[PDB]
Design a protein around this ligand. Structure first.
Ligand SMILES: NC(=[NH2+])NCCC[C@H](N)C(=O)O
Ligand SMILES: [Mg+2]
Ligand SMILES: [Mg+2]
Ligand SMILES: [Mg+2]
Ligand SMILES: [Mg+2]
Ligand SMILES: [Mg+2]
Ligand SMILES: [Mg+2]
Ligand SMILES: [Mg+2]
Ligand SMILES: [Mg+2]
Ligand SMILES: [Mg+2]
Ligand SMILES: [Mg+2]
Ligand SMILES: [Mg+2]
Ligand SMILES: [Mg+2]
Ligand SMILES: [Mg+2]
Ligand SMILES: [Mg+2]
Ligand SMILES: [Mg+2]
Ligand SMILES: [Mg+2]
Ligand SMILES: [Mg+2]
Ligand SMILES: [Mg+2]
Ligand SMILES: [Mg+2]
Ligand SMILES: [Mg+2]
Ligand SMILES: [Mg+2]
Ligand SMILES: [Mg+2]
Ligand SMILES: [Mg+2]
Ligand SMILES: [Mg+2]
Ligand SMILES: [Mg+2]
Ligand SMILES: [Mg+2]
Ligand SMILES: [Mg+2]
Ligand SMILES: [Mg+2]
Ligand SMILES: [Mg+2]
Ligand SMILES: [Mg+2]
Ligand SMILES: [Mg+2]
Ligand SMILES: [Mg+2]
Ligand SMILES: [Mg+2]
Ligand SMILES: [Mg+2]
Ligand SMILES: [Mg+2]
Ligand SMILES: [Mg+2]
Ligand SMILES: [Mg+2]
Ligand SMILES: [Mg+2]
Ligand SMILES: [Mg+2]
Ligand SMILES: [Mg+2]
Ligand SMILES: [Mg+2]
Ligand SMILES: [Mg+2]
Ligand SMILES: [Mg+2]
Ligand SMILES: [Mg+2]
Ligand SMILES: [Mg+2]
Ligand SMILES: [Mg+2]
Ligand SMILES: [Mg+2]
Ligand SMILES: [Mg+2]
Ligand SMILES: [Mg+2]
Ligand SMILES: [Mg+2]
Ligand SMILES: [Mg+2]
Ligand SMILES: [Mg+2]
Ligand SMILES: [Mg+2]
Ligand SMILES: [Mg+2]
Ligand SMILES: [Mg+2]
Ligand SMILES: [Mg+2]
Ligand SMILES: [Mg+2]
Ligand SMILES: [Mg+2]
Ligand SMILES: [Mg+2]
Ligand SMILES: [Mg+2]
Ligand SMILES: [Mg+2]
Ligand SMILES: [Mg+2]
Ligand SMILES: [Mg+2]
Ligand SMILES: [Mg+2]
Ligand SMILES: [Mg+2]
Ligand SMILES: [Mg+2]
Ligand SMILES: [Mg+2]
Ligand SMILES: [Mg+2]
Ligand SMILES: [Mg+2]
Ligand SMILES: [Mg+2]
Ligand SMILES: [Mg+2]
Ligand SMILES: [Mg+2]
Ligand SMILES: [Mg+2]
Ligand SMILES: [Mg+2]
Ligand SMILES: [Mg+2]
Ligand SMILES: [Mg+2]
Ligand SMILES: [Mg+2]
Ligand SMILES: [Mg+2]
Ligand SMILES: [Mg+2]
Ligand SMILES: [Mg+2]
Ligand SMILES: [Mg+2]
Ligand SMILES: [Mg+2]
Ligand SMILES: [Mg+2]
Ligand SMILES: [Mg+2]
Ligand SMILES: [Mg+2]
Ligand SMILES: [Mg+2]
Ligand SMILES: [Mg+2]
Ligand SMILES: [Mg+2]
Ligand SMILES: [Mg+2]
Ligand SMILES: [Mg+2]
Ligand SMILES: [Mg+2]
Ligand SMILES: [Mg+2]
Ligand SMILES: [Mg+2]
Ligand SMILES: [Mg+2]
Ligand SMILES: [Mg+2]
Ligand SMILES: [Mg+2]
Ligand SMILES: [Mg+2]
Ligand SMILES: [Mg+2]
Ligand SMILES: [Mg+2]
Ligand SMILES: [Mg+2]
Ligand SMILES: [Zn+2]
Ligand SMILES: [Zn+2]
Lengths: 181, 141, 53, 77, 110, 69
RNA sequence: UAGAGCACUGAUAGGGCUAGGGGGCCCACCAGCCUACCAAACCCUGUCAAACUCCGAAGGGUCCCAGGUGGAGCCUGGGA
RNA sequence: UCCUAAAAGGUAACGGAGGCGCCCAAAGGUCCCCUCAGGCGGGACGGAAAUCCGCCGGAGAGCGCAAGGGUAGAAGGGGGCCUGACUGCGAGGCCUGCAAGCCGAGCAGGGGCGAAAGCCGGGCCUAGUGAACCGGUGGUCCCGUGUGGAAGGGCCAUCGA
RNA sequence: CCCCGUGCCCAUAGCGGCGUGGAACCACCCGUUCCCAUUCCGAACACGGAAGUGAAACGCGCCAGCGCCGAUGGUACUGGGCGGGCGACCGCCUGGGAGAGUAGGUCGGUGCGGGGGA
């Protein structure tokens, strides 16, 4: 595996601080990062130019991983939705790629957000997972203003082995997640 | 008055009326009850008449519990028509009452008030009735 | 069977003898049906082609 | 007036045909059913309409297996 | 609640049972591999073979091929010939496939 | 992974405007950014860019204390 | 199936709790406070069902062995 | 299809309720993989309900369509390769006045999938239909009215309710 | 006696809670070169390994909050035989005999084959 600043920071500075702060008895009992699933809810490309390959290209550039499609589980009248119609994207990032993307997200992305005042503290799962949203894709460094055609945000779900929101917030803020409160 | 707000089927067969009551044979709410002695289909008009009579006797005060609800749809063919050509049209709703069911219960009223109100209520019914009070036999069920 | 769902025959491409009758949707499947059926005159498998009944 | 009701289908004469212990031959239909109210057991096949038929000559025997269902077998002779 | 593991296990095993043949049941751990021929008519195991009982070397693939050879050799001694391969929840590939190939190399009929 | 469908990750230099350099991995080996976490106002303590005013209203008038008393 | 039962499909009276509205204070500065008002879901107490059943008889049916010699039974054909 | 139908089958009325006269070239065969509806919490536009994550959840979802039965230890969702939606038959039964309708192991021919055991003679099942007579089309090369041919017919397949 | 496979009974076996087990076995685990794999992801599947941990999963104990099981007695109902009511319906005899509820039970039992132990 690759040598990364964020993974090394975890194993070096975040592990012992956590063990001290909570008093874990086992090495595995400590909270670890499990996965980070990114999902462009899209749905704007139902009809119109359903060719959403620009958005999937953007995701493949930001994550270094080609996303997959998501389709409708049912047809919906008001949403102009036919069952089985491609309406979104979802890429599951784990391990080294997860660390890479989280590094670039914490060091570049979250700063470049318009009127950024921190991440919402109450956005925790209750089981020890966190979620957030993004209004644009220009936030990430791999996306410039020329190669973009339309603004399209995304959803980020970070899944942690922690059991309470307390341990999860500890791990995430220690890793460098900026919380507004 | 009393009738179901919705049903799975509009018309029912007539069935039978044999046996004592399946349930509701013991007081369970009020201080007194009116219990049936002979089986019948008690129409919603009769139940409403009995209720109105009891509350009109109380004038104000007390509490009335109606433990039967008319869910059986009564049917009747149009006047002066011959047999056949379908089943009749629903003209009302009845409650299957069998021997030994408490149809009404009164609570929170003097003994004389409850007795006389249950009497005037029974006089609106198409069957013989008995006035009962809550016993430890009821309390044990 | 209707007007859009037609009945048809299958012809052994090798001896030109119709051997099977079936049905297709000419709107959902506007090409001639090609399959591989057992031709008994040839006593072997053969690609049969759709033929107007 | 009139009616829109009077119609029904010819009864289908379904059910068990060879109760447990009944000696049977190869091919005797054992059960007729919609769905798998009884499931095929040893030496018992099932057909495209859920019909259980004996695969060998023998004797019918039932076996209720709790949550696994009800099975019919043919003990060889 | 069942897991896809158990569902897959049931799904292949019932279709094995229906064929009324003896089943060479395979089990594959992270370290070793085990295989026993079962007659489900009596709920009895006839012949067993494993790398834990035969004390075998390193390569799990060649190890499984050797345990298959041993299982087939011990099976042909008891009159067994035809059998049905119980691959369990394991895809017929790699270690389990090598076990099956070793079993066939010993004369087992499947 | 599936070969031929993923943009290759390579060692990447992410340069910030404040002079911060970040050694990471990305599809573009060099990327310049206008801001990073080491110089954003919310991160670096409370570097309130222009407005660290104090409201300043309303009692901050005090022009002046010349009315008689 | 009879009976029974409410776990499923529906009905259902009272009470509890409680999305939602109605109404009343209090506001357009967006929220608040009170409900002897109608009331979803959920629980409590008490019920109803040919097309409801977690239950479920007596009987009924069929095969086996046995008693059963009766204007009993089985096969082929004539006549109604 | 369900009720009436009185716990085997069957059972009537101008008795109570609904559906059918289609469809699918995959919605068929096989091998491999996967498991719902719903409730709670979290999440840019995004909402009761679009897609994402977590936890609870045995089946209340799904199974083209009426109803019932059946069903995740799949009959449901996805993919691969395919045409068994076979030809010659058919032990033995369900049902039943007749005629019909239905299920069918197995043997052979040439196949499909599978490493294999095996499975496949359309479809989770129960409606999606029409006896003969007359005639059309393809094949067969059986009859050919003194003989050789032809006309016309027979036989196999399918059409015109 | 413990563990690992694989059946049978078909919840007296389940949910939840607490505790225990890593020598062995099993699991997680270290890797992703090779085989194989993801409608993206070595999560799953799959291969090569053996540093660590029993944190998860699993196994084994204990608890009756839920769930499941459930007598005895009586009753409903009823095959057969008799009565009563103008009827709706109601009794008696004989044989059978529920469902609900009560007491109570249950945090499984057992077969075959392997590895270890006395
Ligand atoms: N043993 C019996 N089957 N009894 C039936 C009782 C019926 C009788 N007609 C009655 O009213 O009581
Ligand atoms: Mg570690
Ligand atoms: Mg929170
Ligand atoms: Mg968590
Ligand atoms: Mg950018
Ligand atoms: Mg009547
Ligand atoms: Mg009347
Ligand atoms: Mg009437
Ligand atoms: Mg009438
Ligand atoms: Mg007249
Ligand atoms: Mg009336
Ligand atoms: Mg009266
Ligand atoms: Mg009760
Ligand atoms: Mg055909
Ligand atoms: Mg009409
Ligand atoms: Mg009609
Ligand atoms: Mg008709
Ligand atoms: Mg009929
Ligand atoms: Mg009929
Ligand atoms: Mg019928
Ligand atoms: Mg039967
Ligand atoms: Mg079949
Ligand atoms: Mg079928
Ligand atoms: Mg038995
Ligand atoms: Mg048997
Ligand atoms: Mg490859
Ligand atoms: Mg009843
Ligand atoms: Mg209910
Ligand atoms: Mg209850
Ligand atoms: Mg009924
Ligand atoms: Mg019971
Ligand atoms: Mg019986
Ligand atoms: Mg009967
Ligand atoms: Mg009998
Ligand atoms: Mg008889
Ligand atoms: Mg005899
Ligand atoms: Mg004689
Ligand atoms: Mg005679
Ligand atoms: Mg005669
Ligand atoms: Mg004569
Ligand atoms: Mg019937
Ligand atoms: Mg019936
Ligand atoms: Mg019947
Ligand atoms: Mg019959
Ligand atoms: Mg396909
Ligand atoms: Mg289909
Ligand atoms: Mg959900
Ligand atoms: Mg929003
Ligand atoms: Mg939403
Ligand atoms: Mg369903
Ligand atoms: Mg498929
Ligand atoms: Mg397929
Ligand atoms: Mg091929
Ligand atoms: Mg025959
Ligand atoms: Mg016949
Ligand atoms: Mg037909
Ligand atoms: Mg063949
Ligand atoms: Mg063949
Ligand atoms: Mg073959
Ligand atoms: Mg092959
Ligand atoms: Mg073969
Ligand atoms: Mg066959
Ligand atoms: Mg069909
Ligand atoms: Mg299918
Ligand atoms: Mg017809
Ligand atoms: Mg004629
Ligand atoms: Mg004629
Ligand atoms: Mg002709
Ligand atoms: Mg000639
Ligand atoms: Mg000639
Ligand atoms: Mg001539
Ligand atoms: Mg000549
Ligand atoms: Mg000529
Ligand atoms: Mg000719
Ligand atoms: Mg001719
Ligand atoms: Mg004609
Ligand atoms: Mg075990
Ligand atoms: Mg421990
Ligand atoms: Mg160890
Ligand atoms: Mg240790
Ligand atoms: Mg290692
Ligand atoms: Mg590689
Ligand atoms: Mg190599
Ligand atoms: Mg791994
Ligand atoms: Mg694994
Ligand atoms: Mg543990
Ligand atoms: Mg496991
Ligand atoms: Mg444990
Ligand atoms: Mg105990
Ligand atoms: Mg029970
Ligand atoms: Mg009980
Ligand atoms: Mg008893
Ligand atoms: Mg009697
Ligand atoms: Mg009586
Ligand atoms: Mg008696
Ligand atoms: Mg007795
Ligand atoms: Mg009991
Ligand atoms: Mg228990
Ligand atoms: Mg437990
Ligand atoms: Mg046994
Ligand atoms: Mg031992
Ligand atoms: Zn040919
Ligand atoms: Zn900077």
């Amino acid at each position: 595996p690759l040598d990364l600043a964020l993974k090394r920071k975890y194993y070096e500075e975040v592990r012992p601080e956590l063990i001290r702060r909570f008093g874990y008895q086992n090495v595995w009992e400590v909270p670890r990062l499990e996965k980070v699933v990114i999902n462009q809810g899209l749905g704007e490309a139902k009809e119109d130019a359903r060719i959403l390959e620009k958005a999937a290209q953007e995701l493949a550039l930001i994550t270094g991983q080609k996303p997959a499609v998501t389709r409708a589980k049912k047809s919906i009248s008001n949403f102009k939705l036919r069952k089985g119609m491609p309406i979104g994207l979802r890429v599951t990032l784990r391990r080294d790629r997860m660390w890479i993307f989280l590094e670039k997200l914490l060091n570049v992305a979250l700063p470049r957000i318009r009127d950024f005042r921190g991440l919402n503290p109450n956005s925790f799962d209750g089981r020890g997972n966190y979620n957030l949203g993004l209004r644009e894709q220009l936030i990430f460094p791999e996306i410039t203003y020329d190669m973009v055609d339309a603004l399209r945000g995304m959803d980020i779900a970070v899944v942690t082995t922690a059991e309470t929101d307390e341990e999860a917030r500890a791990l995430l803020e220690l890793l460098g997640f900026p919380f507004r409160k | 008055m009393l009738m179901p707000r919705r049903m799975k089927y509009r018309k029912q067969q007539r069935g039978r009326l044999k046996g004592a009551t399946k349930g509701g044979d013991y007081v369970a709410f009020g201080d007194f009850g009116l219990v049936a002695l002979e089986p019948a289909w008690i129409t919603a008009q009769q139940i409403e008449a009995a209720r109105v009579a009891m509350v009109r006797h109380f004038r104000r005060g007390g509490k009335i519990f109606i433990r039967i609800f008319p869910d059986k749809p009564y049917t009747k063919k149009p006047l002066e028509v011959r047999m056949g050509k379908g089943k009749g049209n629903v003209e009302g709703y009845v409650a299957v009452v069998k021997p030994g069911r408490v149809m009404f219960e009164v609570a929170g009223v003097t003994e004389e008030q409850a007795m006389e109100a249950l009497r005037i209520a029974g006089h609106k019914l198409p069957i013989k009735t008995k006035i009962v009070r809550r016993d430890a036999y009821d309390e044990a069920q | 069977a209707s007007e859009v769902r037609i009945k048809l025959l299958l012809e052994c491409t090798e001896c030109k003898r119709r051997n099977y009758a079936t049905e297709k949707n000419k709107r959902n499947t506007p090409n001639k049906l090609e399959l591989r059926k057992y031709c008994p005159w040839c006593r072997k498998h053969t690609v049969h082609r759709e033929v107007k009944i | 007036g009139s009616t829109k009701n009077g119609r029904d289908s010819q009864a289908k004469r379904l059910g068990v045909k060879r109760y447990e212990g009944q000696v049977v031959r190869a091919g005797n239909i054992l059960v007729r059913q919609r769905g798998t109210r009884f499931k095929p057991g040893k030496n018992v096949g099932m057909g495209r309409d859920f019909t259980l038929f004996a695969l060998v000559d023998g004797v019918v025997e039932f076996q209720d297996r709790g949550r696994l269902g009800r099975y019919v077998h043919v003990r060889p002779l | 609640r069942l897991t896809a593991y158990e569902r897959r296990k049931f799904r292949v095993r019932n279709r094995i049972k229906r064929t009324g043949r003896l089943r060479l049941s395979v089990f594959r751990s992270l370290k070793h591999i085990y295989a026993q021929i079962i007659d489900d008519e009596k709920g009895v195991t006839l012949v067993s073979a494993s790398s834990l009982a035969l004390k075998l070397k390193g390569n799990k693939t060649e190890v499984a091929r050797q345990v298959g050879r041993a299982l087939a050799e011990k099976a042909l001694a008891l009159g067994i010939k035809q059998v049905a391969f119980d691959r369990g929840p394991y895809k017929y590939h790699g270690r389990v496939k090598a076990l099956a190939e070793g079993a066939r190399e010993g004369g087992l009929e499947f | 992974m599936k070969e031929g469908i993923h943009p290759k990750l390579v060692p990447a230099r992410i340069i910030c405007g404040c002079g911060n350099v970040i050694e990471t991995y990305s599809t573009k080996p060099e990327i310049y950014v206008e801001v990073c976490s080491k110089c954003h106002p919310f991160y670096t303590g409370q570097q309130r860019f222009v407005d660290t005013e104090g409201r300043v209203e309303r009692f901050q008038r005090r022009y002046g204390d010349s009315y008689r008393k």
